[PDB]
Every structure is written in C-alpha cells, then in structure tokens.
Amino acid sequence: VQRIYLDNNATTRIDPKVKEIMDPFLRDHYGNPSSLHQFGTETHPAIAEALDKLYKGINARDIDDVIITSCATESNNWVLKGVYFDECLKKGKNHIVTTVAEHPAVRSTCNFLESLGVEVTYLPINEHGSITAEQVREAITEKTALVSVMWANNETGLIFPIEEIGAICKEKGVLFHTDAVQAIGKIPVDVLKANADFLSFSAHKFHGPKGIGGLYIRSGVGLTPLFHGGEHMNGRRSGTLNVPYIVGMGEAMKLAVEHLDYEKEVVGKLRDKLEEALLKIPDVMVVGDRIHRVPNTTLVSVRGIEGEAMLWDLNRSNIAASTGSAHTAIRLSLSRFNTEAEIDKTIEVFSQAAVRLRNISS
Amino acid sequence: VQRIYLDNNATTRIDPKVKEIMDPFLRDHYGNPSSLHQFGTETHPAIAEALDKLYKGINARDIDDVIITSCATESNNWVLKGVYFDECLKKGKNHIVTTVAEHPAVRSTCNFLESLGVEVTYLPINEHGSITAEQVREAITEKTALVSVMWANNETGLIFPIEEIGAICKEKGVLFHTDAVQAIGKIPVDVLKANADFLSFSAHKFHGPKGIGGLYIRSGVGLTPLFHGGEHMNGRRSGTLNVPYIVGMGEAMKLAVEHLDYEKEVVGKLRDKLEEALLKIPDVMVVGDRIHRVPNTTLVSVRGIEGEAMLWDLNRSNIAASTGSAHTAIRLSLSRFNTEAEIDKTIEVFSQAAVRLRNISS
C-alpha cells in the first residue's frame, strides 16, 4: 500500500537520524543526569551538545536560557501564567495583548486569565489573513505586561511581522513572547532579530519526538516556575530530564535549519505545484495571503463542500490532511519527505474526489 | 568492565520489553492521535491498551481518570496549584497539610503557595522515620483544602499509613493526594483502598522512560488545568500526546505489578542481604525503621564519613549510589535487575572502601 502524509502542521515523522541518535539513551545510557556518579555524568556531553544545537538553531546567546519543557503547550502556559504572577498580580500591569489566530494553548490560557481578572485583548484578523505591528501599538497601555503573537499561523501558515512587533515592544517596555512552533524548520528563526523575551517550540513539528519542546528565555528576564521543585534546568523547570528526547530534539533542530534552504527551494516548489495545479478546479480559493507564508502550507476552500467530508474521502485513498477555519477549509501541510510523485498523485485524487462529491450533491 | 547500578530510587533502566514496545511509534506510527485520518486513528488501540494497563495497575475504575503528564513533578505542581484555585482562592479553604519528607516537587510548590498567602503545615518526622495518621488529624481545620502525603519516602524508602489517612480524609471531607512514585512497582498500589482523590507517579522509577508520568483523578473530583488549551486528555491536560512514551509506560506498569511478588521475595531478600551483611562494619546504622519499608531501599550512615565521600570512592569502582538526609548518609536502591553476585561484590567493595577512608582519617 502506498500512503501520502500531508498533515505536517499536525505532527511530522521523526527523522531517522533523530531516531538513531536517541537510541543509546533508551538502552544503556539510562542514568539520571542529576546523579553524581558515572551513570549520571556520562550523559552530560550528549545533553550539552543537544542544547548547543538548540541555542544555535534560534540564535540564542550563551547568556540566554533555552529551557527544555515537555512541549510547546507547557511553554505557552508557563509564559502566560508566569507573567501573570510577575507582571500582573505583582506589578499591577493587568493587561495582555494577543491575537485570535493564536493556538488554543495561548488563547485558552488567556481565557482562564481573564477568568482571574486579567483583561486580555485578542487582536482581530484583517482581510490579508495577517496582523500588523501598528495594530498592537494602539492596544498597548500602562497595564500591558506582555504581548504574545505567534510567529506563524498553524492553520494558514502565514508569517507575522515579528521584527516590527519586537521593535515596538523594545521601545514601549513590554514583554514579548512569540509562539514559534510553526516557524522552526520552516523559515529562519532569530530571537535576537525578533527582540523576543520568550519563544516557544515543540520538537514534533520539525521531525523530533512528541512530548518535548522548549522555551527560550532572554537574559535577566524573570519568569516564575510552572514546574516548581527547583533543581533542574537552573531551577526554572523541575523534573528528571527527558534525556532521549532532549538529545533527539537537538539533532532534530540541527537538521531542521540545515534544511532551511531546501525547505524554501523544493518543499516550497512542491507546495506551489500542489497549490496552483490545484486551484485549476472551479470554485476554489486559498484562504488568505500567499506571499507571507511558511513554505510548506496551503489552506484551500472548496465552494460547496465542507472541509471534513473531503478529508474523509481523501483518507480512503491513503492521503492524510486536516481542516482549518475560513464553513471549514482543508489544510495540506508538506515536509522534506514528500516527493513530486506524491503531489502529482494528490492533485489527481483530490480533483477526482472533488468532482465526485460535487455531483452526488444533486 | 562490569558496573553495578544501585541508584534505582534516582532512575531505573528501561525494561527491554518496554523499549521494544515503544519502537514502532518512533518509526512508522508517528501520527498525531488527535488527527481524524488513518495516521491518527491507527494509534488509538495502542494508546487505549497502554491506558488500560495504567488503570489496572493502580486499580483505578473506569469512572476515574488517569491523566498522562510529562512527569510526576508535573502531576504534583498540578494537584497543588489546582487545589489552590479551586479550594483555596475560591472556597476560602486556605490550608494544606503535608509532610517535610515530601519530594521538593511538593514542598517547593507549597513554599510558593505560602508565598501567595496559603498557610501550609509541614508535618514533622518522628523517631520511627514515619508519620502517623492521627498526626494530620490534629492539623486538619476548616481551612484545610488538601492533605498530601507521599506513599513512600524516596530517601529511606519507608511506607506511610496511606489507608489510615485515606479514612481520616474520607471522614473529615478534605481532598487527599498521595505522591506514589516510590510505591509503584515496589509495593501494591490501590487508589480505592487509599481513598485517594489524587495520585502521582513517574514512569522512570519502574523501568519506563524519563519524561512521562501520570496523575490519577477520582471520579467527579475537579482540578483546574495546569496545561490549558483543553483538547487532549478530556480537556484536563492539553498538548500533543507523547505516544511512544505512553505505550512504553503502560507496558512498564504492567511488568512492574507483574513483578510485585518477585520484588518482595528476591529483590527484598537481596536488599536484606546487602543490609545485614553490611551492618557488620563497626559504627554503622540504617537510618530509620526497617519494618515499614519498600523492598528495594536501604539508607545507611557510616559514623565518621560524610555520605558523599563514600559515594565518590564507590564510583571509582563502578558502583552507583546516592546520598540522603539523616551529616549525610548513603542510599542504595535495588531493582529487579540486580544479582546476588552483584551485592556480594558490593559488600566487598563497600567494606574495603569504608575501612580505607576511616584509617587515612588519622
């Protein structure tokens, strides 16, 4: 049987080099890195190199932290809740600015925060499917503790003006967090250029395992623990380290940046092929802008078919995809593992499935 | 070279059957279980069986939850912080009772909670190295939201009277949490017998991977998310599921209970051998009670040697162990993988190392 994975914005496959690098730490290198003996110290080089890859991948500096967490969602809840106690309860800066495009990890936590009495303003989405930096400018008040905008939308795949917002925030003295999970491995990421205080990522979106991610914390910025017990990760996030995954995610990030050119030049080419070969069906449009997008994502609506339906049908022919808010539209999410063969086949099976669904309509 | 691992209360080695069961989900079964297509649905049976093993392992009932978390420390911070908003801020029950023996995941979070204005009373440890259930009884007030006592001490390895406290709490209407990480795989665990509302475990203490654990939540007991974003785990803990680890931890727990008899009957026998063959050195005593202990742990002090020292020396001869509060004492932590050969050797190298350190003293 031959299947086609186009659900990469949902999760990706672990690169074999990632699997390989991790295996030893699930076999004999199973010491706890906190221990003082050989079983624990023996794991330090591996860990250190993995971390090196992470720092290097996002151009964090030695004086910054990249804290290992259990996933981006941990990262997000941590920034929001920590800024809550630090900035909102303790310094009275009881406002947060974010967007409506933000992953439920951000919005939902915000929802809880307003439940506690924070006022959060969710920036509305424009015609262009984007946000503009001036848009937060006329929302930052003396009460704003934090602005949080995602680096790229998980649904449409379009990049936001992170540098702009970075500059705004630098200027007006408000903490900046970017949820960058959709950015890693897809477009260059630079916390320095972004003037970010906080950045989130999750490994399984760039060919590492599910169940680990990271939060970048900028030098001398404080953030009260979400995991108290303060021994590991410079006391900012306690719990025995996930050695195998840490080593894997480090390799994963290395490979991701190493394939940044490929991502734009062929995965992007393939994405454009799927897209413009695909819009040759009647009555179909891509949801939002096609310029300021991540190379691997296309979100298409077909006029007179609910997104899900097309998904179920496509599944039957061994091709995986997801939905996305526009009724609902369908999201196709490529990766470095897809072939031209595969998307030719996709154009075929998609058009076929579309026209069949449309005419049994009557 | 041949090494001897006796640091099992710090972390354990993954059972090979655990490694084996997990491998497929790091290779081709890499779908995201939330997805609707074949890549996601294909993982449901595996997950469901893994969860079945967890429920079965702790005698949770179908109407209870066992929520996958990223480790026990997550579990602990979650119970404490959630009970904080639910019971303390919202119902005015601004007291918690716990012990001083509790892992830093519990105590440290408590420390933060008193920073916010909760009053926490840490029960003191007796002569017997234990706690008595009547001890919490004369500390539970109209303000008590929660009592938290660990099922077994990570340092001495001694069991606490969980049933007693369970009954007390049932009676007096206060939420009960037990951090059971040291109990799993070591002594029978029964949330029902324990009348627990909440129970924590971490897989890497019973031969699963580091970086996953669980929180048992009793039917109709509420607990506000620590991970908001409310999609996975019946909206109680959001973030893409850690498939490989979930499957592994399930196998891990199955094997742990399956070896409960062995644990008491041979690992315990080996532990007793190390212990009574070991106390034949002058000036040495085991820290606390030797009756109400987990089968695999011995914590010994040597009179006139700081624990660490003995640790460094023992490391040089390829034998791993840890310290523990009494100066400091040394903790030897066995598992189902240790052999009689190994502990004979240990008695040898320990006595040798002890007498050498003692006489270069002069």
Ligand SMILES: Cc1ncc(COP(=O)(O)O)c(CNc2co[nH]c2=O)c1O
């Ligand atoms: C009772 C107990 N609770 C919580 C933890 C924290 O576990 P985690 O969240 O999986 O990191 C440990 C680990 N105990 C020890 C870990 O290292 N040395 C120990 O004695 C523990 O023994």
Ligand SMILES: Cc1ncc(COP(=O)(O)O)c(CNc2co[nH]c2=O)c1O
């Ligand atoms: C931007 C962004 N933030 C956070 C998350 C949460 O990641 P986690 O903590 O690793 O589970 C996702 C995952 N995005 C999607 C996950 O599933 N479908 C998606 O579109 C994401 O795309």
